[PDB]
Amino acid sequence: LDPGLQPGQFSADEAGAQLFAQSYQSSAEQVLFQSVAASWAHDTNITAENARRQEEAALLSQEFAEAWGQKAKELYEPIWQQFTDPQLRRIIGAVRTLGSANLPLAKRQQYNALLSQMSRIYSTAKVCLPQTCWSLDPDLTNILASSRSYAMLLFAWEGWHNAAGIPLKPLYEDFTALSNEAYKQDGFTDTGAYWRSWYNSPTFEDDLEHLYQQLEPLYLNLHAFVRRALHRRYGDRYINLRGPIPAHLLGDMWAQSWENIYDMVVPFPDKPNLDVTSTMLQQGWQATHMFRVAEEFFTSLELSPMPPEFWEGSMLEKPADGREVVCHASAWDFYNRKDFRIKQCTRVTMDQLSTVHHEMGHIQYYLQYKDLPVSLRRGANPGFHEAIGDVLALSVSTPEHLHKIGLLDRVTNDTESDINYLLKMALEKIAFLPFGYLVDQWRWGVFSGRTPPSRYNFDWWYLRTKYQGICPPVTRNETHFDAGAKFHVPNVTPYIRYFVSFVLQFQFHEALCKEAGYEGPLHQCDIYRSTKAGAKLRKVLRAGSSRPWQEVLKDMVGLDALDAQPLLKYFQLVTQWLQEQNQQNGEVLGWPEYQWHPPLPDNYPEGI
Numbered sequence: 001l002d003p004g005l006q007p008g009q010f011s012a013d014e015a016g017a018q019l020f021a022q023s024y025q026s027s028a029e030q031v032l033f034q035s036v037a038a039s040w041a042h043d044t045n046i047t048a049e050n051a052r053r054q055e056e057a058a059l060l061s062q063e064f065a066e067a068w069g070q071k072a073k074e075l076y077e078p079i080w081q082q083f084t085d086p087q088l089r090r091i092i093g094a095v096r097t098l099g100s101a102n103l104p105l106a107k108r109q110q111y112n113a114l115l116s117q118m119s120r121i122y123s124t125a126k127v128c129l130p131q132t133c134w135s136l137d138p139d140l141t142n143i144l145a146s147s148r149s150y151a152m153l154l155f156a157w158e159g160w161h162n163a164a165g166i167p168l169k170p171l172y173e174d175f176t177a178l179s180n181e182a183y184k185q186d187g188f189t190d191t192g193a194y195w196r197s198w199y200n201s202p203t204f205e206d207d208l209e210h211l212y213q214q215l216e217p218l219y220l221n222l223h224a225f226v227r228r229a230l231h232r233r234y235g236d237r238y239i240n241l242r243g244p245i246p247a248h249l250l251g252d253m254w255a256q257s258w259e260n261i262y263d264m265v266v267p268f269p270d271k272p273n274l275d276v277t278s279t280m281l282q283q284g285w286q287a288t289h290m291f292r293v294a295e296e297f298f299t300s301l302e303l304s305p306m307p308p309e310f311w312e313g314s315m316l317e318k319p320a321d322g323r324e325v326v327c328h329a330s331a332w333d334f335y336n337r338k339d340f341r342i343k344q345c346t347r348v349t350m351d352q353l354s355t356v357h358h359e360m361g362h363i364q365y366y367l368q369y370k371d372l373p374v375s376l377r378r379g380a381n382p383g384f385h386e387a388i389g390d391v392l393a394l395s396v397s398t399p400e401h402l403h404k405i406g407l408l409d410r411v412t413n414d415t416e417s418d419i420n421y422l423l424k425m426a427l428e429k430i431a432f433l434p435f436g437y438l439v440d441q442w443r444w445g446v447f448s449g450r451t452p453p454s455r456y457n458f459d460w461w462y463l464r465t466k467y468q469g470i471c472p473p474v475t476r477n478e479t480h481f482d483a484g485a486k487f488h489v490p491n492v493t494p495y496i497r498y499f500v501s502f503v504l505q506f507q508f509h510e511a512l513c514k515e516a517g518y519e520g521p522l523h524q525c526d527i528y529r530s531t532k533a534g535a536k537l538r539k540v541l542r543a544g545s546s547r548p549w550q551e552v553l554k555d556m557v558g559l560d561a562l563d564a565q566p567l568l569k570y571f572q573l574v575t576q577w578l579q580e581q582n583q584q585n586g587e588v589l590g591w592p593e594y595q596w597h598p599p600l601p602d603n604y605p606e607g608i
């Protein structure tokens, strides 16, 4: 490591730790910036040379973290928890956690290789036919979303899970062992305990379960309503009105979001859909204007505009020069207090306008906490960033807001269109809740050893049926590794944050709507042009992770805890309607025939 980047001499007391932390920040910004810039250069210009430069930068960052982490532990391990400065305790406490840097040199290289291999297996997995082959993006995704042929959906679902999961299993086993070995040296019983420690809650798992108990009735009613609709479409041979739903029929490879089957379940189909896409096109909107419109939403709250560096450096539309890029939208903090960017192959549609606002919500977060020490430039807990992005989108998606920005002449007030709106939202927000909760329950069991490799798939499908009420549409056994067929598993990205953020965002919404002086149905609230809501946002965002998330949340919503009631209050109208619908049809809530699996279609897979 360059001598100017490794730590010098510092004294083993709090005053010395302040100097240590300031010197850490100076070098850390350089290291962090070069890593983000190298990822940016690759993700906006995918070449092998750029991929190589990115790996160089990542390994420099790892080397930096180990050098400063070992120094921090040598000097402050027995004393940092008694420092009087709480932000210093947060900084030092993070620096002394080495993760994979605790592994012997060859194991550390193996750990990094496993991460790269697992990521590559997932991104190149494909489903071949009895011939060309399909890729997850966009081939299989579009089949799951729009095909209504049971056997076709089945072929894509089975093909993908076998292709992505099976080769991952031997690697995931080795990753699990090395990951645990590394974090045991940081003082954690296993990797899952380290992930959970980010929430700094002695009763995190109990708190989560109590939350889900309050949410489960809404999911069960949505599940039974949708299961009825599927029964009408595919018949009694493939749909058990008292059993789990076959996992490939909900519009999504993982059945985590059901909005792609909205057309089957529309409460009131005779009402016009809400889609202002064509009006955007007639008004001449393009990607840049969409971002300027999003920017004006933030300035209307007296939040910060996008700085010139954002407009100069961002990739707001797919480059015309034929460059290969990552088109999925993402927001970038370069950790130099200067460069902040969005990378998105923006298209001119209503849904994309909502995404622009969401992603700019991430940028606004970055800009508000950019004067904090680098270690504290993150959300108050790992679920805050998505919750901030999503709460802004909750306002911007309403017909009320679309009217105000010139995209919808007349706002209807018939209750039937309200139900349609809420049911569409529920297919996205409520259907996801069991999946967001269960993924890390599976990984926590794997990390702790309660789920050895011999029961990876058994415990995966236990959780999937228990919470989502689905079953695999073909028989599975322990040669299959269906957890591996979800991006975040081989790419080792924690997941409970997303369940947390789905709860949080409705807590945020209620608080901000009240601060905005809004009165009426929560799902019609738009905080646009409320400087009082903007002030309340500003105080959460500028805090970064400098303070306990429970206290930041208390200042914002008046409660120091996650709470499911604001979500239930948002959806109360459609929850009521679903209950009535299910009781009119005499539905069984749940899946009492838990052993049920559907049969294979005749002569599978010689089909169209």
Ligand SMILES: *[C@@H]1O[C@H](CO[C@@H]2O[C@@H](C)[C@@H](O)[C@@H](O)[C@@H]2O)[C@@H](O[C@@H]2O[C@H](CO)[C@@H](O)[C@H](O)[C@H]2NC(C)=O)[C@H](O)[C@H]1NC(C)=O
Binding pocket: 474, 475, 476, 477, 478, 479
């Ligand atoms: C585990 O399953 C594999 C895969 O077989 C498929 O999945 C099963 C659950 C079942 O639905 C089968 O009908 C499917 O074909 C089994 O490996 C297959 O074994 C058969 C013998 O019946 C053999 O002819 C195939 O060549 C095998 N297929 C592959 C891809 O290897 C395996 O036997 C099952 N049991 C165990 C313990 O692994």
Ligand SMILES: *[C@@H]1O[C@H](CO)[C@@H](O[C@@H]2O[C@H](CO)[C@@H](O)[C@H](O)[C@H]2NC(C)=O)[C@H](O)[C@H]1NC(C)=O
Binding pocket: 045, 047, 048, 049, 050, 323
């Ligand atoms: C995309 O990345 C490639 C690198 O892989 C860039 O090509 C390099 O361009 C510089 C000049 O900027 C040359 O000095 C190098 O010799 C080039 N490398 C190769 C392998 O040809 C390319 O310019 C980038 N494209 C854009 C639009 O930024």
Ligand SMILES: [Ca+2]
Binding pocket: none
């Ligand atoms: Ca997503």
Ligand SMILES: [Cl-]
Binding pocket: 195, 198, 382, 383, 494, 495, 496, 497
């Ligand atoms: Cl998390």
Ligand SMILES: [Mg+2]
Binding pocket: 351, 428
């Ligand atoms: Mg959406």
Ligand SMILES: [Zn+2]
Binding pocket: 358, 359, 362, 385, 386, 389
């Ligand atoms: Zn986001």
